Write an enzyme that holds these catalytic residues in place. Structure first.
Site, PDB file in Angstrom:
ATOM      1  N   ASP A 225      -4.367  -6.612 -12.549  1.00  0.00           N
ATOM      2  CA  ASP A 225      -4.479  -5.782 -11.363  1.00  0.00           C
ATOM      3  C   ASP A 225      -5.589  -4.768 -11.478  1.00  0.00           C
ATOM      4  O   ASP A 225      -5.400  -3.733 -12.078  1.00  0.00           O
ATOM      5  CB  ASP A 225      -3.116  -5.066 -11.239  1.00  0.00           C
ATOM      6  N   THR A 226      -6.714  -4.997 -10.824  1.00  0.00           N
ATOM      7  CA  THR A 226      -7.792  -4.005 -10.861  1.00  0.00           C
ATOM      8  C   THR A 226      -7.540  -2.757 -10.024  1.00  0.00           C
ATOM      9  O   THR A 226      -8.308  -1.804  -9.982  1.00  0.00           O
ATOM     10  CB  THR A 226      -9.082  -4.702 -10.412  1.00  0.00           C
ATOM     11  N   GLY A 227      -6.422  -2.820  -9.319  1.00  0.00           N
ATOM     12  CA  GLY A 227      -6.065  -1.712  -8.449  1.00  0.00           C
ATOM     13  C   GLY A 227      -5.171  -0.716  -9.150  1.00  0.00           C
ATOM     14  O   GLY A 227      -4.928   0.359  -8.639  1.00  0.00           O
TER      15      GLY A 227
HETATM   16  C1  LIG Z   1      -0.948  -5.136  -0.077  1.00  0.00           C
HETATM   17  S1  LIG Z   1      -0.257  -3.581  -0.743  1.00  0.00           S
HETATM   18  C2  LIG Z   1       1.296  -4.312  -1.330  1.00  0.00           C
HETATM   19  C3  LIG Z   1       0.978  -4.895  -2.686  1.00  0.00           C
HETATM   20  N1  LIG Z   1       2.035  -5.790  -3.127  1.00  0.00           N
HETATM   21  C4  LIG Z   1       1.769  -7.070  -3.315  1.00  0.00           C
HETATM   22  O1  LIG Z   1       0.708  -7.578  -3.002  1.00  0.00           O
HETATM   23  C5  LIG Z   1       2.860  -7.881  -3.909  1.00  0.00           C
HETATM   24  O2  LIG Z   1       4.081  -7.413  -3.407  1.00  0.00           O
HETATM   25  C6  LIG Z   1       5.207  -7.912  -4.051  1.00  0.00           C
HETATM   26  C7  LIG Z   1       5.231  -9.144  -4.696  1.00  0.00           C
HETATM   27  C8  LIG Z   1       6.369  -9.592  -5.328  1.00  0.00           C
HETATM   28  C9  LIG Z   1       7.540  -8.837  -5.349  1.00  0.00           C
HETATM   29  C10 LIG Z   1       7.550  -7.573  -4.700  1.00  0.00           C
HETATM   30  C11 LIG Z   1       8.718  -6.743  -4.679  1.00  0.00           C
HETATM   31  N2  LIG Z   1       8.771  -5.547  -4.091  1.00  0.00           N
HETATM   32  C12 LIG Z   1       7.664  -5.152  -3.496  1.00  0.00           C
HETATM   33  C13 LIG Z   1       6.485  -5.873  -3.452  1.00  0.00           C
HETATM   34  C14 LIG Z   1       6.411  -7.132  -4.073  1.00  0.00           C
HETATM   35  C15 LIG Z   1       0.763  -3.815  -3.716  1.00  0.00           C
HETATM   36  O3  LIG Z   1       1.174  -2.678  -3.542  1.00  0.00           O
HETATM   37  N3  LIG Z   1       0.136  -4.203  -4.825  1.00  0.00           N
HETATM   38  C16 LIG Z   1      -0.068  -3.286  -5.952  1.00  0.00           C
HETATM   39  C17 LIG Z   1       0.468  -3.925  -7.243  1.00  0.00           C
HETATM   40  C18 LIG Z   1       1.928  -4.319  -7.132  1.00  0.00           C
HETATM   41  C19 LIG Z   1       2.299  -5.627  -6.892  1.00  0.00           C
HETATM   42  C20 LIG Z   1       3.637  -5.964  -6.792  1.00  0.00           C
HETATM   43  C21 LIG Z   1       4.620  -5.010  -6.920  1.00  0.00           C
HETATM   44  C22 LIG Z   1       4.251  -3.715  -7.159  1.00  0.00           C
HETATM   45  C23 LIG Z   1       2.920  -3.369  -7.266  1.00  0.00           C
HETATM   46  C24 LIG Z   1      -1.545  -2.874  -6.019  1.00  0.00           C
HETATM   47  O4  LIG Z   1      -2.236  -3.929  -6.591  1.00  0.00           O
HETATM   48  C25 LIG Z   1      -1.738  -1.650  -6.909  1.00  0.00           C
HETATM   49  O5  LIG Z   1      -1.928  -1.793  -8.113  1.00  0.00           O
HETATM   50  N4  LIG Z   1      -1.661  -0.468  -6.266  1.00  0.00           N
HETATM   51  C26 LIG Z   1      -1.464  -0.377  -4.816  1.00  0.00           C
HETATM   52  S2  LIG Z   1      -1.195   1.384  -4.464  1.00  0.00           S
HETATM   53  C27 LIG Z   1      -1.734   1.982  -6.097  1.00  0.00           C
HETATM   54  C28 LIG Z   1      -1.633   0.784  -7.040  1.00  0.00           C
HETATM   55  C29 LIG Z   1      -0.351   0.809  -7.819  1.00  0.00           C
HETATM   56  O6  LIG Z   1       0.667   0.303  -7.362  1.00  0.00           O
HETATM   57  N5  LIG Z   1      -0.420   1.406  -9.002  1.00  0.00           N
HETATM   58  C30 LIG Z   1       0.672   1.353  -9.983  1.00  0.00           C
HETATM   59  C31 LIG Z   1       1.092  -0.089 -10.291  1.00  0.00           C
HETATM   60  C32 LIG Z   1       1.874   2.168  -9.500  1.00  0.00           C
HETATM   61  C33 LIG Z   1       0.132   1.944 -11.280  1.00  0.00           C
END
Ligand SMILES: CSC[C@H](NC(=O)COc1cccc2cnccc12)C(=O)N[C@@H](Cc1ccccc1)[C@H](O)C(=O)N1CSC[C@H]1C(=O)NC(C)(C)C
Lengths: 99, 99
Positions: A25-27
């Site tokens: 995850d680059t995010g």
């Molecule tokens: C399009 S925005 C929604 C996105 N989620 C997804 O693409 C995938 O979602 C899911 C997939 C599978 C099960 C899940 C269960 N409950 C919720 C979401 C799920 C997302 O928030 N992705 C984030 C990673 C992630 C994926 C799946 C679960 C939870 C987190 C993002 O890449 C990140 O790194 N972000 C986005 S906001 C800041 C930062 C982040 O969350 N940082 C951390 C991980 C808290 C350090």
């Protein structure tokens, strides 16, 4: 390796001689792993993503290996749905985004 | 470009004639931006991540440029901590993870 993004970029990691799947995850600035009980010392921390904040325990200097490459650093353990490898470890394995 | 991950992967996007900054995020399935007016018609949707589930508006078939590369795709607008470009638009611009 080169990983395309048609699917979620999940890979195998090893931590404490057990394999897990984890998303690259680059995010994410941090690495967040599913609840487990590591030995070692921790601090409380709160991290925020899309829907808000969760509580995690922060362990320092954990060695993980990601597709055969070692990395050592801070890992946060809490109730995440998926194991997340964030930029703190991705730099150590030399990962880039290219387009 | 080949982007290292020592810093957050922020880039400039053009959307609806505005220029904005956004993070290239391989852990996101979809693209979420902060509140704005986009032309076009929208549908309420829910997305989730760490911390839970938020409601967003979905605009389909929006043209956006990410470092001068066009993508035409679904864009979600909602209460996000950061503007995220997700895998839905990263594939269109031919983005990969390499190490
Ligand atoms: C399009 S925005 C929604 C996105 N989620 C997804 O693409 C995938 O979602 C899911 C997939 C599978 C099960 C899940 C269960 N409950 C919720 C979401 C799920 C997302 O928030 N992705 C984030 C990673 C992630 C994926 C799946 C679960 C939870 C987190 C993002 O890449 C990140 O790194 N972000 C986005 S906001 C800041 C930062 C982040 O969350 N940082 C951390 C991980 C808290 C350090």
């Amino acid at each position: 390796p080169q990983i395309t993004l048609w699917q979620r970029p999940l890979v195998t990691i090893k931590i404490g001689g057990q394999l897990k799947e984890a998303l690259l995850d680059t995010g994410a600035d941090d690495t967040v792993l599913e609840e487990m009980s590591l030995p070692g010392r921790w601090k409380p921390k709160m991290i925020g993503g899309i829907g808000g904040f969760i509580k995690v325990r922060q362990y320092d200097q954990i060695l993980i290996e990601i597709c055969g490459h070692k990395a050592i650093g801070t890992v946060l353990v809490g109730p995440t749905p998926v194991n997340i490898i964030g930029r703190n470890l991705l730099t150590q394995i030399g990962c880039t985004l290219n387009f």
